[PDB]
Subunit: 169 residues, 4 copies
């Protein structure tokens, strides 16, 4: 059967970098891959199919696809759980990267569902913006409104450890 590996953690924790490392491993082994991002390059702080609904993946999966790679999974509809389950049942390995928690420390539900299904969970850490320790597990929003769905980078979000998050809040 296919195995599901979920790579999660706060922003800047190396989730996309790890995901791309896995893509490279499959490519080096001459295994066909399909790479997806929500609505073209997967960029760290490769080319992907940009899709809206998880079900669109099926358009781009071939008989000999061995691995499916999905970035920013927190932005996908939770139906991604059942789509992934079906890929695993068909012998296709799946690798997902995404945020575990919003900047308000609420779960991203799609990520949470995938963590449930995962054969392996890799929790990544970032360097804390405040204290410089390699212990950041949260993201804090420093600009924009309070919205939990709000695309952005270092102008809007910083990685912090739990103590620094509580101090700053």
């Amino acid at each position: 059967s296919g195995k599901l590996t979920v790579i999660t953690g706060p922003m800047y924790s190396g989730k996309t970098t790890e995901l791309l490392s896995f893509v490279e491993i499959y490519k080096l082994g001459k295994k066909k891959v399909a790479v997806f991002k929500p609505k073209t390059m997967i960029v760290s702080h490769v080319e992907a199919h940009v899709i809206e609904r998880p079900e669109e993946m099926r358009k781009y999966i071939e008989e000999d696809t061995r691995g499916v790679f999905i970035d920013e999974v927190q932005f996908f509809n939770p139906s991604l759980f059942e789509v992934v389950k079906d890929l695993l049942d068909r012998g296709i390995d799946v690798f997902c990267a995404g945020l575990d928690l919003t900047h308000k420390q609420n779960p991203f539900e799609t990520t949470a569902l995938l963590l449930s299904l995962a054969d392996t969970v890799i929790k990544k850490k970032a360097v804390c913006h405040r204290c410089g320790e390699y212990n950041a597990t949260l993201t804090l929003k420093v600009a924009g409104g309070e919205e939990e769905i709000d695309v952005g980078g270092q102008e809007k979000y910083i990685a912090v450890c739990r103590d620094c998050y509580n101090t700053l809040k």
Copy 2:
């Protein structure tokens, strides 16, 4: 801050055994622990626990010098457990939670899913597949009783299987 470690996997994967290992570690270090299970008193694998109905009941048993909180069968607790645990971590208390990730129908257990999202560390445990004997079982399959997803029981009702064996047997 406290760290949250979530130990998950199918039945018979050693989740409770691992949880009790960490209890032992804290006890050897003369660190105060609080141990909980959902509503008898014995946390026993295939230690004494406070048997509680609701996550909000944990506060009564958490003293000022509690260093670790240990919770088994977390799939059966109300999802309010998420904010309770977050508060403990903010106060510097380490939390260890053991529970099933998936029902026998491969639906997520909500509370476990939420705690996986808050976790600093996730330990996915495997079991031996009842069918092929490999150490690759990640799922539980229900072999007796009804189709119900909430149904307490052991070997008389559930086996651990790998994905391929689960699909084959279904």
Copy 3:
């Protein structure tokens, strides 16, 4: 091919307990195992063949042996490296537990050689006898002479973290 897993760390770090957990996994799967200790029970703080030389293992390995489990590997002749390599080549998984360092912080050479060969290395920690933190990586000798080969338990050896070791020395 067989895979080699080495479980190492100071005394009281759970190495035998982990080794026995692996034995149980193979037994539950109805896979034949062969279990060895140096010169009858493997006891944590199962029955084993007590042997002197690593080459004696071959007397007790059968065509359908799937796993070989060796405790206290630090006490075996370094020829255990080549014996293990041959088992792996034959498709037999090998699990070794043993101390990485003496109480003088010198390497146990047999363990070191096996760490080199290992597919997976599990470093176990103990609770520090002095500070109570789960950070003990060393063993300190508190009775007996200075000998590095000296069988014993808690009457002779304690597990300590590096800072506590240096403080106590």
Copy 4:
């Protein structure tokens, strides 16, 4: 105390890439680092380093506020590296070492073996097997040049293989 992390595996397993990742982590935290390679200056994967012949030469480049020491290609350093590293750990400096565990003939590299024994954490990396394409290569096989076990080189001389493929090709 400082902790020692040893990153090992066959060629092309990402050892240097992982080592440089940890360098980056310390640099982002504004922690002083010292980076070494055996005797040009660039540590480059398949950052600037001090190129040194002997482990005893590291002391010159370690300042009072050095937080991390990073060492690549440790298999080529004298086994005296063991006591040098032990001393750094005793002084509170974290050490990260990357190196091969085994020669192409499957003999242990002595210095790597000693550091594996001192390590707090061992990361075994794999490569893609040149023969079967699976992510299961743990060995290096020499495909050109002589039988020598000390022979600097890359893809023109060495491939990564799994155990079964190594045995088959031999």
